[PDB]
Amino acid sequence: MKDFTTYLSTAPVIATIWFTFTAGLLIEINRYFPDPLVF
């Protein structure tokens, strides 16, 4: 499992998971708060 976690800790896998999390957060934010143009 140590090798599997080390593989999941590589730059492309970490980048994929992080961008998926950030994109999902932004998408859900725009979903529950439609059309935010100002504060």
Binding site for another protein (CB under 8 A): 6, 9-11, 14, 34-35, 37-39
Distance between CA 22 and CA 26 in Å, rounded?
A: 6
Tokens of 22: 């950030």
Shortest separation between residue 20's beta carbon and another protein, angstroms: 15
The distance of Cα 11 from the centroid of its chain, to the nearest Å, equals 14
Query: Looking at beta carbons only, is 1 or 38 nearer to another protein?
Result: 38
Q: How far is the CB of 34 from another protein (least distance, A)?
A: 6
CA atoms of 10 and 27, how far apart (whole Å):
25
Q: Least distance to another protein from the beta carbon of 27, Å?
A: 15
